[PDB]
Amino acid sequence: TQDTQLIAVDEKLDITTLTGVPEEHIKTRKVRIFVPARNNMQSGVNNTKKWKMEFDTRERWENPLMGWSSTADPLSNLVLTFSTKEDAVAFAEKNGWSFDVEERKVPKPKSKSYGANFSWNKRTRVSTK
């Protein structure tokens, strides 16, 4: 499409050689690819429509001077939104992170009927509205 000496490279993409992630943080860290759960105390579902990749939690010790939440894992507060799952995971191997994939939990379709609240025989008659 370009006539620019298109070599047919086959080896899977690995840019971990260049991103500069230190040796500890590239192999040991395990990332999790999941759809965020709907915050149960709310009711809206806008926050559960984008795949997100986050890293495992590490030590959180209190600073001696004043009680803090000091940590020493730079990859702690780093989440990344992703449209679809295969695109999210494609980032993981490309950056060589041992990934763990969940599946998109979605509400199963329910059947609601206001007429059921007042039935003649069925034991679904609501006691008070």
Add this chain to the structure above:
Amino acid sequence: KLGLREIRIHLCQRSPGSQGVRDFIEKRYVELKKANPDLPILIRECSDVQPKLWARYAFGQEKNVSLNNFSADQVTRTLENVLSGKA
């Protein structure tokens, strides 16, 4: 003494290769338990897992033998060989 501390089979519920061991446990299993009540024949199963037999001998000893496409009597002999050496 390394005699048959426990026996573990891992078969698939639906894989055609696992069909052989499924028939074996369907017929030639109750007799095995009555023969060796002490020896626990674990049948930990799963899906898409090739039929596989694990044996546990004495201190940290474990041997492996696949049961892929093994016939009914084929796996009975395989276990019979395993528990033949009750030591």
Add this chain to the structure above:
Amino acid sequence: GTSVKPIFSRDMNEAKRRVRELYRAWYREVPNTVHLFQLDISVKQGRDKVREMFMKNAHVTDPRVVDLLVIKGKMELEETINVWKQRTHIMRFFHETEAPRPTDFLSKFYVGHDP
């Protein structure tokens, strides 16, 4: 698909070539910086550090990738022979102040909950 646009190199071989004159330049470069930068390490103590990066960077196979860090190495070499870096910058390669980190599982277990 499999067809990708290569940076400079056209397969592994000249990609393997480019890492050579980087090593050719780096090796010639070590003794004068030890003199010019007034380093504390020996001339011998610089070649290994130049060396050990190279097969530390050995699992890489993609020709495009290989050519990508040979530019980074060339740039690092570029920013070295004009004394643009300083003693601290060069010495950062020698992990000196950072105490040795354990490797065995038992020592990992003793220090803290971390893999």
Add this chain to the structure above:
Amino acid sequence: DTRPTIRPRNDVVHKQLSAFGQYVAEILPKYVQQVQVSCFNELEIFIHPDGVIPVLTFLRDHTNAQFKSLADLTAVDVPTRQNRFEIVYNLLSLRFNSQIRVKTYTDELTPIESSVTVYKAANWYEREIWDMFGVFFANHPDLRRILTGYGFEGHPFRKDFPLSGYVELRYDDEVKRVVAEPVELAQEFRKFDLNSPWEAFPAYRQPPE
């Protein structure tokens, strides 16, 4: 206008730029992939990466375009998109007091021809983009770090890069020189999940995938 809060709309400019959008699209159908004008009258020229040099020369030299000022040269790293980085140019036309935006896409490995020839301003912008993101620009006069410290590894503006980074600095007396240590915050960055669980804009609702 009864409405005192809503920003006024300029349909004349909207029609004017949209016609020029069809113009540039017809002249260079080889590189131009998409052309759109936003609600606030800004024209985005979606080109293919190999069109960075040809398309730019057209808007810089054609009599009817005359975009002779490189406003800026940025990239927005989108980890989602297959080719993550997206190089963005902004051009200002002195003669026709209009602004255009040519945007192209690029992954980590594929290089983009340097626009130094068509826009000599791009030269220093060229260095920054590689330094912050890692997009290597082909046939550049001198590609080098311009912002990060000497010997700094990694590309900071890349999304996967942590906010605090990996390397700290301090003075250590047994070496009598500034030394680098692994990052160790006295306070971790308190990240806030400040996203409403309710849809904000029905107009921009994504299709029900």
Add this chain to the structure above:
Amino acid sequence: ILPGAAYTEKSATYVNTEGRAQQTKVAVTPPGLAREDWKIIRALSEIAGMTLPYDTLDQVRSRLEEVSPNLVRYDDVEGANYFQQANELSKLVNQQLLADPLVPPQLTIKDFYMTDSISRASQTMAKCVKAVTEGIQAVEEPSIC
């Protein structure tokens, strides 16, 4: 008194009552000097002499796969079979039923909260037990929220 982590301080695998092995991710690190649980035995085996093979979390799950192939497959009921052979295997002994009526240990809301070490330790659980034992007025937290 080798201290271990808790169910919110590790990446363990707990299986439910229907055979659905679920993973529990780490939320807060173990307090004090306590380590993970499998990191105790593995460290203990190395010093003792009979060193265990697995050294990382992925390794132990792989071994955990070796012992049983369902406790690694996450969030999927590996529907078992073979109810019938366990039946004729069962009528062997035949035992004999006693006369004690079937009485569950939990009979009233009172005994619900005091079940496990985590529940017994907690103060809020004790307050709920107090709330249901005596009358309906001796429990309140002063708060003008």
Add this chain to the structure above:
Amino acid sequence: FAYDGLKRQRLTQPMIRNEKGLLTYTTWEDALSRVAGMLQSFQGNDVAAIAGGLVDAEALVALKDLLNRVDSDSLCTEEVFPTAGAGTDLRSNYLLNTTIAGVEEADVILLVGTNPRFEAPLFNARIRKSWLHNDLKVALIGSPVD
């Protein structure tokens, strides 16, 4: 409302018995060394282990392998299941075969000698939900617990 138990009485450091018989804090090495030292001595079926309630499958398999390299197949647990017959061999025995969701299409149920409300509260809710909608006929043999 049980997270506060995590902040209540907790073990932080390894502790071993002193001369008099009072547990005292100590380093990890000697606590492991004392355990490892006299685990080496005794072997055979004289080394047991009783796993508790909130245990990790990783922890179970680690203890199982460690306590089988001394040849001690006495790995026990608090809950008791009849070993007569299939016992632990056949998975179909010791689990909810029908799956929790299955109770939402069952016709009749037979709760035998249990109080699911305080044993497995969520499981009781599914019975109620299916009892509410599908009109399941619950039968209980045992205590008259509500």
Add this chain to the structure above:
Amino acid sequence: LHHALIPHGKGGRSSVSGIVATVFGATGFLGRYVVNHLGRMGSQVIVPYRCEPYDTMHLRPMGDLGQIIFMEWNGKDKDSIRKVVEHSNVVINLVGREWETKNFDFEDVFVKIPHAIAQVSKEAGVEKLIHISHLNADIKSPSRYLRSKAVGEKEVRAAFPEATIIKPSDIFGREDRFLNYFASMRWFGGVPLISLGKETVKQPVYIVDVSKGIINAIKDPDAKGKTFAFVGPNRYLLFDLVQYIFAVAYRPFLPYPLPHFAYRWVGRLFEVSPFEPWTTRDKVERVHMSDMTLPHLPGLEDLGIQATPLELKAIEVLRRHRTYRWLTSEMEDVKPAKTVNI
């Protein structure tokens, strides 16, 4: 262990190692590096001082906020020591000078106060007192310093039985007053060595190794009661050592013999200065004292620290003394000196 002393975090500036050190006399050569290692891992250091706080400013930028808190203490007042070491678990003693001020005799800064820290620390509740004394410490040595250190070790050991005693040989480093001593000898004509200094064998040790030795001794649970002798890898005859120093500095070497009684007279003249003396009669004796070999004494490699030969890190001390001519000269320019080995 106290809940505020449980080790926490990967070893770093903000890490809680769990050590509450009380390094005494840290405002000096030895004290400078020991706090640096203590500060690096992260450890509350009480660092008492007596001098002007300005001279303690360089002690500040080597630890996290609120980790190098300073306190004012006096050597002849027990109450100052008790306040400084009140809430702590490890006490490091580095007090002691090489001259004789009118307000402090040699036996004072090596017995009297070192007794005071030793006695008060036990009453307060410290568990890892580490007192430092010269390796050559002999009761009947010709020099009072070497005598005072020997009786000093005896007294602290009695008061604090489980007090690790570190016995360093001559320590070289940037501000060492050992390599600089011979380097500065060029000013006064040639380099005067008694009998050409051909009958005195010295075994110096680099400063950082002894600094890591103290840190490892604190962490090591077996340092209780033991007496370590920190010595370098090789022993060098003093004449060859001075040959090595002046070769590294590229200054001309002009040795000449000097009878012992006349050098003692020279040391007397230099003591007259009411400021920091350059050479005392005691100092002249020390240069003559060859490092006694004590193989029975547990050395340095048992701790884990590998000694660094003086040949490697010698330009650090002597690059400053070089003129502009041979300023950029490297290590390999000057050959390693001959080493009389054990």
Add this chain to the structure above:
Amino acid sequence: GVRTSPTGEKVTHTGQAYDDGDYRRVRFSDRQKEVNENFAIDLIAEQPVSEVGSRVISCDGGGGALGHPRVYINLDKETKTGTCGYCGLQFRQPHH
């Protein structure tokens, strides 16, 4: 108010006090442990309760815009004087 710890420290309003060992106590020596004497907990108790006669009572906190968002306290439960959740001022019905 401000009490004294067994070590000698001053407990604050939150009740924080470094215990006996508490190596962190070294900072306060040669210094002071800053404690505010005007304890908010007991500085609001002595304020009298208003005997206003109604069923719903507003509380601006004084000064109008200078106060806190206007909340309506329900003075109906005749066991416990209603208090504004913003300032703690106790309001009560005049016992009929």
